[PDB]
Enzyme design. Structure first.
Site, PDB file in Angstrom:
ATOM      1  CE  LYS A  90      81.616  72.032  73.556  1.00 29.55           C
ATOM      2  NZ  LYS A  90      80.594  71.806  72.487  1.00 29.55           N
ATOM      3  CE1 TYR A  91      77.173  64.284  82.778  1.00 32.31           C
ATOM      4  CE2 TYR A  91      77.678  62.818  80.980  1.00 32.31           C
ATOM      5  CZ  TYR A  91      77.472  63.033  82.314  1.00 32.31           C
ATOM      6  OH  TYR A  91      77.572  61.994  83.200  1.00 32.31           O
ATOM      7  CB  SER A  92      81.542  63.936  78.698  1.00 35.33           C
ATOM      8  OG  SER A  92      80.480  63.109  79.124  1.00 35.33           O
ATOM      9  CE  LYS A 102      83.453  68.403  71.435  1.00 41.03           C
ATOM     10  NZ  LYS A 102      82.629  69.260  70.542  1.00 41.03           N
TER      11      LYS A 102
END
Lengths: 490, 526, 306
Positions: A1-3, A130
Site C-alpha cells: 500500500k502506498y498511503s 490502513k
DNA sequence: GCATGCTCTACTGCTTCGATATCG
DNA sequence: AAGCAGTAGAGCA
DNA sequence: TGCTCTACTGCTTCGATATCG
DNA sequence: AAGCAGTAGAGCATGC
C-alpha cells in the site's frame, strides 16, 4: 500500500526491579528506557512523521484504559508524534522525575498477564486507517512472570497464539541484566540488548516510493511498451517557510491582483497578452501561442537505433540519472520482451539511444539507455536494480572551450613519491555516511526551539578532513615533496 | 569584446543554376545565412556584421574598372545588424546574375575592413565565404592574397556546395554526392582552394571547409567570434600546506534563454500602465486586511507551527569560512559508480598563469595519478553564501590539455533504495529461444556503428553532441515570422529541423522484416 | 463587487465553483437590474473572454462544466440589456458564432451538458439576432432534427423549444420582407410535405410538420392568395380520416389534437372568403377535443386549453 | 404505447504529495 | 534578493 | 606621470514563485 | 501520480 502506515506500541515494565539501580551507581534501566523512547520520537518527528505511535506502562497501582482491568495504565493514544506529548514525556528523568512517577501512580502490584496483550490488541482494533507493520517493542527485564502458577503461562502462550493468528509482531528490547546471552529461559514460544542504534543512527531522513512518470516507448511506430520512470537521487532540501500572523499564531493566506491603467478598477486575466521588446519593435503574442511554440512531439520515448558502450564518455552528463522499468498495467505482457531484450543486452553489451519527451508538452532531449543487472547473496542483499539507466547528453552551446594554448612536460620521478602519499591517504570510499552539514545543523536548531532543552546542539561537521590525522599519517615528507624538483625561493 | 564579422555571398550565374532533380542550392544558401543572422541578432551580443554580395546586374564599389571589380556590390557595411538585413534577404530571392570572378571579393572586403577599423577594439574577426566554385575565375594574383590572408589576423571559413567530388534533402546523416558531382572548373577550383587552405592553416584546413549539408547541423558558423569563458582562480590544498594556486573553468551546463515574457494588457499594447501586486489579507474569518509588519516566518514541526522568523536564523545560521577547495583524501577503488554524479555543472580545474611552475607541479600530480584507478574527493565551496559540497575529481590526460574534472556527489539523505522484483528467476516471464534469436536479429540489424579501413577504430555517425538544440531555433524563427507577417497564424516548423533530428531510415529498412517477425512471433501486445 | 473581485485572482479555483459563480453573476443580473446599471457592460466581456479562451484553443481538452456555467449565465444576462443587431451587428453575430460552435455537433460523445445549454440559449432568446439566421437554416434544421431523436428525456424537449422558436422567428422575417423568399418558403413547405408523408412511426416529425405548416400558412397570403385557399382544405382533408373516422374510441393515437387546432386557427385568423362546407366537421373535431381530456399530461393539458 | 418505480457501473473530479521550470 | 572579483572614471599629487 | 580607491557590473548563488502529474 | 467517492447517462419493471 502506498498511503499505508505503521503502528508502534511501547510497553514499559514497572513492577519491582527495573526501577532499581541494580545496586549500581551508573544509570537505571527505567531511565535508559525513557532515553530510548524520547530518542525514537525525536527521530520520527522529522523522519517518518505519519506513523502511528502509542506508549503503555504495565503493572502499576492505578489503571486508566477503555476496558478497566487492573495494573494497566496508558498515557498516549495511537496517533501522530506530538511535541506536547514528548514535552510531557521528558519530565520523567532524574530523581525528581522518578518521584513524579511515584506520586502520580507509584508502582508495584500483582501485575499483568495475558491482559496487557489484550489491551494491546484492543488498542490496535480501533484505529481506522490502513496498517502494514504492527510491532511491539516491550521494555522488560525478567524471564519468568509466571514464577508461581502454570495456568498463567498456559493462557499467556495461548493468547500469544491468538495474537499471532492475526499476526501482531512483538520483539522486545531485553535489558542488560547479564549484559548478554546467559538467561535463555522459556520466553521463546511467544516471540519468533542492542540500543545504541536506536539512540543515534536515525538523525534526519525521509522515506517514500512513488513513480514520477508512466510513459511509453515506441520503436518503429507500432511497438509500444509501457514503462515507469523513477528517480533515485531526490536532491532534498528543507520544508517550506510558512508565513504567520503576529500575535494570535495564525496563517495569513494572502492574495494578488493586477489593475491600474491610471484609471483604477480591476482587470481580469482574460485581457492579457505577452510580448517581447527589441529597442523599438515589440513582437506580441497570446499566451496560447507562447505555450504553443514549445510543442514538438507527443509524450513518450522514441527509439533511434543502437550504440556500443565506448563513445559515451563519462565526461558527458547534464542530469541526475533516472531509472526505468516495465510494468504490466497498461500493455499486457511487455516484461517478457523486456526480459529478453535485457538478456541480449547483457550478453552483447549494447545500449540504446532514444528521444525523450516526458510530460505532455516539452521540447525533446536525446537520452541513452544503458543496461543493468542485479546482485544478490543469501542475506537478501538486493543492492542494484535490474533494468535500464538513462544518461543525458548535451546538444550545442553547453560544451564551451578554453583558450587551449598551454602545454608543458614533466619528469617521471614523482610518481613513486605520490604513490606513497596516496597509499598513506588510502581508504575504501564509502557505503553511506557523509551527512549534510547545513540540514543537520538546521534540524538540530529547530529541535532546540522544539523541545527547549537548553540551546542549539552544535551539530558536528563531517565534510571537513581531519588535518592532524593526515599530518601524522603523512609525516615529514611535505617539504621535500614541495621542493624536490620545484623550489619557489621567492 | 567586439568583433567585425564579414560575409561573402554568391548568387552568381551557377548559383542561378537549376536543380539536380531534388532542390536548389540557393534556397539552402539563404536558409543558412538567415539562420546566422537571426542567431547573431537574437543573441543580443555586442558585435558588428558586414555583408557583401556579388552576382547582381549592378555595380556598387568604390573601385570598379572594366572587369576588375565588375558586379562587386558592397551592399552592406560594418554595422550592428537589425531587421533591415533580413528584410533584404527575404527581398533578394531573385537569381539575377552577371559575374566573372569571386576571388577579389575577399580582398575588397578585407580592404574595406582596413578602412573601417577606426577607434574600436577588434581582437578577432571571421569571414564566412560563399562562392560557388564552378564559375570561371582567373589565376592573376595569388601570392599577395595568400600573404595578406596569412597576415591579416582574420580567420576565414569557406563554403562548398552540397557535393564533394540517397534522398538528400538538406542533411540527414547520409551521402553528399549522388553519383558524380564535379566539372573541370570544380576540379581546378577545388584543388586551388585546397592548396590555398593548406598553405593558410594546414591539417585543420582539411576540415576548414563546409558544405550546405552538415554545416546546417553543426555550429561551425561560430568559431573565434565569442569570448571564450570566465576565469576562476582558487588555491588547492592537500593536508596541511600543499597550497597550489589553481585556475578553473566551467563546462557543460543546461543552457537557458535570456529574455523575459512581458505582460501587456489588452487595448494598450503597453506595460507601464499595469500594476501587478499582492495584498496581505488575513482571511481566517471575515477578512481583516493586514500590513507586511505582522509576519513571523513560521516553520512546521510535526503537529504545530513555531516562530523564529528572521533575525534568529540570521543569528544561528550556518557558516563555512569563505571559499575552500580542500582534499578529503583519495580512493584506489573504482567504486564511485556511473550513476551517482548529480550535478548541474561540471568543472575543469586546469592550471594557473604567470610562469606556471605551479601548473607543472599539478602536471606532475596528474601524471602520477593517471596510471591507476586512484581518484580524489574534493570539498568545494564558492563563498560564504555558497554551500559546501564533496565530489569526485576525475583525471583527464589528453594531447594538448591536462585537466582534472570535478563533479558533485550525494549525501546520505539523497539516496533512497527499495526492493524490486527481479526477472531472472521467473516462472511466467521466460522467453524462448526463437524469440531470443528474433531480438538478437533486432539488435544486429538496428545498429549504427561500423568498423573498416583494417585498423578497427570505430566509425559512428549520428553524433548527439554536435546536433543543435531545436528549441531556441524554433522560437527565433517564430519570432521573426510574427514580427514581419503581421497577423498570420504561426507557421509549421521547418523541414531541415527534422532533417537534423531524424534517424537514418536505411536501418529501419534493414530491420523492417525483423519487426514483422516480432509482431508475429511474440505474444500479445495490448 | 465581492463576487466580481473574487474571480480575478490567480487560477486556483477547481472550476466547478467557477461554474456556480458564473451562474450567480448571471442570476444577480437577471433579478433587480436597477442596482447593476453601470456595471452590467463588463460582465458581457468577462463571460465572452472566458468563452473565447475556453473554446478557441489548439491544445488541452476543453474544461467542460465552466462552459455550461458561462452559457446559462449569458442566458440570464441577455434580458433587459439587449445589444441586438439593430444598433450593434458585431457582438450579436459574435455571440451567435459562439453558440453555433456550441451546437456544432461534429462528434458523438456523452454527457450532453454544453449543447443542452446552447439549445436552451437559442430557445429562450432568439429575436435578438435578426439578420444572421437567413442563411444557415438548413444546417440548424439538420442538427436540430438529429437532436430531437436522441432518445433522451431531458434533451428532446429542450430541443423542441429551440426548434419552435426558430420557426416562429423565421416566420415574421420571411413575412415582412419583399418578394425574395419563394425558394425558402417552398423548401420549408416541401420538406414539411416530405415529412408529413413519411409513414413509419414519427409522431414528433408529424407534429413539427403541422406546427410549421400552421406558422407558415400566415405569410403565404402576400402575392398569390390561392395557396392559402388550397391550404386548410389540405388540413381538414388530412386530419379527419386520421382521428375522427378511425382511431377515435380505443387507441393510443389521441396525443395530437393541439397541433391540428393551432394550425387551423392560424390559417383562419387571416383567411378571407370562408368555404362554409366544412364547419360541421370542425364542430365534431373540437367537441372530440373537449371530450378527450383525462388521458393528457400537464404542459400539454395547458396548451390544449390554449 | 407513453410517463413512472428501481438498480447500475464507468467517468470524472477533488485532494494529497511530490517534483520541476522561473524571476529575482 | 545577495555577494565577488573585474574594469573604466576621481584625488592627492 | 603610475599606484590607489571606487562606483559599477557581469555573473553567480539560493530563495520564494509558479505549474503539473 | 495515487486514491477516494458519488454523479449520472443507461437501461429494466410498472402504471393509465
Amino acid at each position: 500500500k502506498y498511503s499505508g502506515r505503521d503502528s508502534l506500541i511501547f510497553l514499559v515494565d514497572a513492577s519491582k526491579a527495573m526501577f532499581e539501580s541494580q545496586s549500581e551507581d551508573e544509570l537505571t534501566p527505567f531511565d535508559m528506557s525513557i532515553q530510548c523512547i524520547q530518542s525514537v520520537y525525536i527521530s520520527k518527528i522529522i523522519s517518518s512523521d505519519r506513523d502511528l505511535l502509542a506508549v503503555v506502562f504495565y503493572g502499576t497501582e492505578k489503571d486508566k484504559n477503555s476496558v478497566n482491568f487492573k495494573n494497566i495504565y496508558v498515557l498516549q493514544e495511537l496517533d501522530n508524534p506530538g511535541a506536547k506529548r514528548i514535552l510531557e514525556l521528558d519530565q520523567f528523568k532524574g530523581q525528581q522525575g522518578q518521584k513524579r512517577f511515584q506520586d502520580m501512580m507509584g508502582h508495584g502490584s500483582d501485575y499483568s498477564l495475558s491482559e496487557v496483550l489484550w489491551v494491546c490488541a484492543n488498542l490496535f482494533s480501533d484505529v481506522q486507517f490502513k496498517m502494514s507493520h504492527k510491532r511491539i517493542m516491550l521494555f522488560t527485564n525478567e524471564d519468568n512472570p509466571h514464577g508461581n502458577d502454570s495456568a498463567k503461562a498456559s493462557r499467556a502462550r495461548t493468547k500469544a497464539g491468538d495474537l499471532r493468528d492475526t499476526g501482531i509482531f512483538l520483539d522486545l528490547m531485553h535489558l542488560k541484566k547479564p549484559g548478554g546471552f546467559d538467561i535463555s529461559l522459556f520466553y521463546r514460544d511467544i516471540i519468533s540488548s542492542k540500543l545504541e542504534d536506536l539512540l543515534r543512527k536515525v538523525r534526519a531522513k525521509e522515506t517514500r516510493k512513488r513513480a514520477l512518470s508512466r510513459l511509453k516507448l515506441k520503436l518503429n511506430k507500432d511497438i509500444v511498451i509501457s514503462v515507469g520512470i523513477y528517480n533515485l537521487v531526490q536532491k532534498a532540501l528543507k520544508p517550506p517557510p510558512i508565513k504567520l500572523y503576529r500575535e494570535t499564531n495564525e496563517p495569513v493566506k494572502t492574495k494578488t491582483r493586477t489593475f491600474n491603467t491610471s484609471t483604477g478598477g480591476l482587470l481580469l486575466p482574460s485581457d492579457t497578452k505577452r510580448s517581447q521588446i527589441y529597442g523599438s519593435r515589440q513582437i506580441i503574442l497570446e499566451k496560447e501561442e507562447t505555450e504553443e511554440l514549445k510543442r514538438f512531439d507527443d509524450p513518450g520515448l522514441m527509439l533511434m537505433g543502437f550504440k556500443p558502450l565506448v563513445l559515451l564518455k563519462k565526461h558527458h552528463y547534464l542530469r541526475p540519472s533516472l531509472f526505468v522499468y516495465p510494468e504490466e498495467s497498461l500493455v499486457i505482457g511487455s516484461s517478457t520482451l523486456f526480459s529478453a531484450l535485457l538478456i541480449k543486452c547483457l550478453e552483447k553489451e549494447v545500449a540504446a539511444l532514444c528521444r525523450y519527451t516526458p510530460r505532455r508538452n516539452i521540447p525533446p532531449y536525446f537520452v541513452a539507455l544503458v543496461p543493468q543487472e542485479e546482485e544478490l547473496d543469501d542475506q537478501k542483499i538486493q543492492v542494484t536494480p535490474p533494468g535500464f539507466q538513462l544518461v543525458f547528453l548535451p546538444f550545442a552551446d553547453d560544451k564551451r572551450k578554453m583558450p587551449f594554448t598551454e602545454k608543458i612536460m614533466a619528469t617521471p620521478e614523482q610518481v613513486g613519491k605520490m604513490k606513497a602519499i596516496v597509499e598513506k591517504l588510502r581508504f575504501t570510499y564509502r557505503s553511506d555516511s557523509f551527512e549534510n552539514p547545513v540540514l543537520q545543523q538546521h534540524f538540530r536548531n529547530l529541535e532546540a526551539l522544539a523541545l527547549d532543552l537548553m540551546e542549539p546542539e552544535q551539530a558536528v561537521d563531517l565534510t571537513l578532513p581531519k588535518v592532524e590525522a593526515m599530518n601524522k599519517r603523512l609525516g615529514s615528507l611535505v617539504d621535500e615533496f614541495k621542493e624536490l624538483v620545484y623550489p619557489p625561493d621567492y | 569584446n567586439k568583433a567585425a564579422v564579414v560575409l561573402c555571398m554568391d548568387v552568381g550565374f551557377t548559383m542561378s543554376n537549376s536543380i539536380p532533380g531534388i532542390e536548389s542550392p540557393f534556397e539552402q544558401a539563404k536558409k543558412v545565412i538567415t539562420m546566422f543572422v537571426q542567431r547573431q541578432v537574437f543573441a543580443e551580443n555586442k558585435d558588428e556584421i558586414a555583408l557583401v554580395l556579388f552576382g547582381t546586374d549592378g555595380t556598387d564599389n568604390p573601385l570598379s574598372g572594366g572587369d576588375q571589380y565588375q558586379n562587386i556590390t558592397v551592399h552592406r557595411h560594418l554595422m550592428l545588424p537589425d531587421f533591415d538585413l533580413l528584410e533584404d534577404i527575404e527581398s533578394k530571392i531573385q537569381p539575377g546574375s552577371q559575374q566573372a570572378d569571386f576571388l577579389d571579393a575577399l580582398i575588397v572586403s578585407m580592404d574595406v575592413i582596413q578602412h573601417e577599423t577606426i577607434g574600436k577594439k577588434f581582437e578577432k574577426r571571421h569571414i564566412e565565404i560563399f562562392t560557388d566554385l564552378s564559375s570561371r575565375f582567373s589565376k592573376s594574383q595569388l601570392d599577395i592574397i595568400i600573404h595578406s590572408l596569412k597576415k591579416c589576423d582574420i580567420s576565414l571559413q569557406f563554403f562548398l556546395p552540397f557535393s564533394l567530388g540517397g534522398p538528400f534533402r538538406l542533411g540527414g546523416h547520409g551521402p553528399s554526392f549522388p553519383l558524380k558531382g564535379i566539372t573541370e572548373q570544380q576540379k581546378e577550383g577545388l584543388e586551388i582552394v585546397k592548396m590555398v587552405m593548406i598553405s593558410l592553416e594546414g591539417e585543420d584546413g582539411l576540415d576548414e571547409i563546409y558544405s550546405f549539408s552538415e554545416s546546417l547541423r553543426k555550429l561551425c558558423v561560430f568559431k573565434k567570434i565569442e569570448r571564450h569563458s570566465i576565469h576562476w582562480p582558487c588555491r588547492l590544498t592537500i593536508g596541511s600546506n600543499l597550497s597550489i594556486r589553481i585556475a578553473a573553468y566551467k563546462s557543460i551546463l543546461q543552457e537557458r534563454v535570456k529574455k523575459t515574457w512581458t505582460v501587456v494588457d489588452a487595448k494598450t499594447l503597453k506595460k507601464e500602465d499595469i500594476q501587478k501586486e499582492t495584498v496581505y489579507c488575513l482571511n481566517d474569518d471575515d477578512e481583516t486586511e493586514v500590513l507586511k509588519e505582522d509576519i513571523i516566518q513560521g516553520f512546521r514541526y510535526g503537529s504545530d507551527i513555531v516562530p523564529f522568523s528572521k533575525v534568529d536564523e540570521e543569528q544561528m545560521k550556518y557558516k563555512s569560512e569563505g571559499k575552500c577547495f580542500s582534499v578529503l583524501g583519495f580512493c584506489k577503488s573504482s567504486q564511485v559508480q556511473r550513476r551517482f554524479f548529480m550535478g548541474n555543472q561540471v568543472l575543469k580545474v586546469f592550471a594557473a598563469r604567470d610562469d606556471e611552475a605551479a601548473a607543472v607541479a599539478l602536471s606532475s600530480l596528474i601524471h602520477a595519478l593517471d596510471d591507476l584507478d586512484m581518484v580524489a574527493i574534493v570539498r568545494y565551496a564558492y563563498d560564504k553564501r555558497a554551500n559546501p559540497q564533496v565530489g569526485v575529481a576525475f583525471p583527464h590526460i589528453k594531447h594538448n590539455y591536462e585537466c582534472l574534472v570535478y563533479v558533485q556527489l550525494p549525501f546520505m539523505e539523497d539516496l533512497r533504495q527499495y526492493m524490486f522484483s527481479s526477472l531472472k528467476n521467473s516462472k511466467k516471464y521466460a522467453p524462448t529461444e526463437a524469440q531470443l534469436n528474433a531480438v538478437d536479429a533486432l539488435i544486429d540489424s538496428m545498429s549504427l556503428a561500423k568498423k573498416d579501413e583494417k585498423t578497427d577504430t570505430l566509425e559512428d555517425l549520428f553524433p548527439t553532441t554536435k546536433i543543435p538544440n531545436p528549441r531556441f531555433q524554433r522560437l527565433f524563427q517564430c519570432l521573426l515570422h510574427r514580427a514581419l507577417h503581421p497577423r498570420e497564424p504561426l507557421p509549421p516548423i521547418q523541414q531541415h529541423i527534422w532533417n537534423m533530428l531524424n534517424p537514418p531510415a536505411e536501418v529501419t529498412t534493414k530491420s523492417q522484416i525483423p519487426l514483422s517477425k516480432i509482431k508475429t512471433l511474440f505474444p500479445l501486445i495490448e | 463587487s465581492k463576487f466580481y473581485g473574487e474571480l480575478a485572482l490567480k487560477k486556483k479555483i477547481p472550476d466547478t465553483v467557477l461554474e456556480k459563480v458564473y451562474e450567480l453573476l448571471g442570476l444577480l443580473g437577471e433579478v433587480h437590474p436597477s442596482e447593476m446599471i453601470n456595471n452590467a457592460e463588463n460582465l458581457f466581456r468577462a463571460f465572452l473572454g472566458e468563452l473565447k479562451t475556453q473554446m478557441t484553443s489548439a491544445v488541452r481538452e476543453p474544461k467542460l462544466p465552466v462552459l455550461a456555467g458561462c452559457l446559462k449565465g449569458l442566458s440570464s444576462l441577455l434580458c433587459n440589456f439587449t445589444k441586438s443587431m439593430e444598433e450593434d451587428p458585431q457582438t450579436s453575430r459574435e455571440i451567435f458564432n459562439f453558440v453555433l460552435k456550441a451546437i456544432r455537433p461534429q462528434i458523438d460523445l456523452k454527457r450532453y451538458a454544453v449543447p443542452s445549454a446552447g439549445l436552451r440559449l437559442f430557445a429562450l432568446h432568439a429575436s435578438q439576432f435578426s439578420t444572421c439566421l437567413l442563411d444557415n437554416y438548413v444546417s440548424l434544421f439538420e442538427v436540430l432534427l438529429k437532436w430531437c431523436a436522441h432518445t433522451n428525456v431531458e434533451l428532446k424537449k429542450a430541443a423542441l423549444s429551440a426548434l419552435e422558436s426558430f420557426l416562429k422567428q423565421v416566420s415574421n422575417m420571411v413575412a415582412k420582407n419583399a418578394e425574395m423568399h419563394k425558394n425558402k418558403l417552398q423548401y420549408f413547405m416541401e420538406q414539411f410535405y416530405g415529412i408529413i408523408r413519411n409513414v413509419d412511426s414519427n409522431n414528433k416529425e408529424l407534429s413539427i410538420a403541422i406546427r410549421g405548416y400552421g406558422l407558415f400558412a400566415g405569410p403565404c397570403k402576400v402575392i398569390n392568395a390561392k395557396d392559402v385557399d388550397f391550404m386548410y382544405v389540405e388540413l381538414i382533408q388530412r386530419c379527419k380520416q386520421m382521428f375522427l373516422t378511425q382511431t377515435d374510441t380505443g387507441d393510443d393515437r389521441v396525443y395530437q389534437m393541439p397541433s391540428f387546432l393551432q394550425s387551423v386557427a392560424s390559417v383562419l385568423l387571416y383567411l378571407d372568403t370562408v368555404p362554409e362546407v366544412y364547419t360541421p366537421v370542425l364542430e365534431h373535431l373540437v367537441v372530440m377535443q373537449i371530450d378527450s381530456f383525462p388521458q393528457y399530461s400537464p404542459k400539454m393539458q395547458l396548451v390544449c386549453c390554449r
